[PDB]
Amino acid sequence: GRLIYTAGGYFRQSLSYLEAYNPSNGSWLRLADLQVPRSGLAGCVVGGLLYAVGGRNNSPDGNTDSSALDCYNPMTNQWSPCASMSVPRNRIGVGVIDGHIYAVGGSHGCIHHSSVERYEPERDEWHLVAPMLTRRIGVGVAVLNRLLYAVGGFDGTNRLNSAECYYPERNEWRMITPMNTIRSGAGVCVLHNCIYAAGGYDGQDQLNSVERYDVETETWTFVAPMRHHRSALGITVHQGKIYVLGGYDGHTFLDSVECYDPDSDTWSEVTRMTSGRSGVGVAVT
Numbered sequence: 001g002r003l004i005y006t007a008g009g010y011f012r013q014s015l016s017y018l019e020a021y022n023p024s025n026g027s028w029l030r031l032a033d034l035q036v037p038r039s040g041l042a043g044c045v046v047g048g049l050l051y052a053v054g055g056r057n058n059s060p061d062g063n064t065d066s067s068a069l070d071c072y073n074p075m076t077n078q079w080s081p082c083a084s085m086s087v088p089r090n091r092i093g094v095g096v097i098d099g100h101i102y103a104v105g106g107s108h109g110c111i112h113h114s115s116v117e118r119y120e121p122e123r124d125e126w127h128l129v130a131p132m133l134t135r136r137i138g139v140g141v142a143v144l145n146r147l148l149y150a151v152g153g154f155d156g157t158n159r160l161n162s163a164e165c166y167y168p169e170r171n172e173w174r175m176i177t178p179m180n181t182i183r184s185g186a187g188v189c190v191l192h193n194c195i196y197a198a199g200g201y202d203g204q205d206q207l208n209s210v211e212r213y214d215v216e217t218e219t220w221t222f223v224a225p226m227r228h229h230r231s232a233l234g235i236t237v238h239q240g241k242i243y244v245l246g247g248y249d250g251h252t253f254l255d256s257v258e259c260y261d262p263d264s265d266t267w268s269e270v271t272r273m274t275s276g277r278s279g280v281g282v283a284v285t
């Protein structure tokens with residue numbers, strides 16, 4: 001009975017939506033608005049609480065990058081402010097290891113971060129850990145085998161096919177095999193022991209291609225492409241399937257939600273969001 005939560009996003013301006021999709025019955029839930037609009041944020045869940053991390057308020061009155069961490073309790077339908085990050089991080093990536101949230105990369109103004117910081121919910125504190133080898137905004141993050149992977153992005157000059165791996169016990173980063181495709185703004189997740197990179201922007205076009213990394217063969221392999229080209233898409237895994245939400249296709253802010261079945265290597269349309277948007281944060285609880 002877990003739900004797919006989508007927070008924030010962008011259509012004409014940054015959005016305040018929190019909505020939840022129930023894949024069992026197809027219902028969409030309209031939940032409490034974020035306290036401040038944001039796009040380019042990431043979502044994650046620790047201990048049944050949903051967290052909205054980073055991003056930016058792109059508004060008619062100006063644009064402000066966010067250092068915010070906000071905590072949503074599904075039992076109370078209430079957002080509460082948590083401790084802010086050391087620095088604003090728009091187009092951030094996040095992963096969770098052992099109950100701690102890692103905020104990876106992103107931008108503050110024209111500064112493209114390589115820094116990474118770790119949130120401990122029991123203490124409501126952030127601390128910096130070792131920075132990545134590469135500055136990355138629009139970065140995808142996946143956690144596998146208690147290791148954290150930072151995939152793709154944009155370093156301020158180069159759009160990246162590179163990826164790297166963080167070892168929390170050693171507090172160090174190592175480059176891994178780069179993807180077949182340059183991707184910023186991709187959806188990155190873990191499914192059945194593989195890291196998936198879906199969509200994104202390769203410097204020329206939004207992408208519908210999807211590739212996955214096998215950590216033991218150290219190889220990236222293309223799988224079935226999605227039905228729509230998407231950059232700045234939301235992504236999550238629910239019941240052994242990947243769900244991708246929204247994104248920009250080069251012309252339209254999509255409302256489409258597709259689902260990847262790894263057993264059949266096929267994508268299907270499962271629902272539409274209540275309105276088209278990109279740059280959402282997504283998580284499941």
Ligand SMILES: CCOc1ccc(S(=O)(=O)Nc2cc(CCCC(=O)O)c(NS(=O)(=O)c3ccc(OCC)cc3)c3ccccc23)cc1
Pocket residue numbers: 009010039040041058091138139183184185186200201231232248278279280
């Ligand atoms: C008409 C599109 O308007 C938009 C489109 C998205 C939005 S957002 O709120 O989701 N924030 C975000 C913006 C951009 C950069 C988009 C800049 C752009 O499209 O010109 C990202 N980077 S990207 O890797 O996806 C990309 C980069 C260059 C590009 O070059 C195209 C020439 C195309 C796409 C984001 C990556 C992750 C999360 C949020 C992102 C707001 C307005």
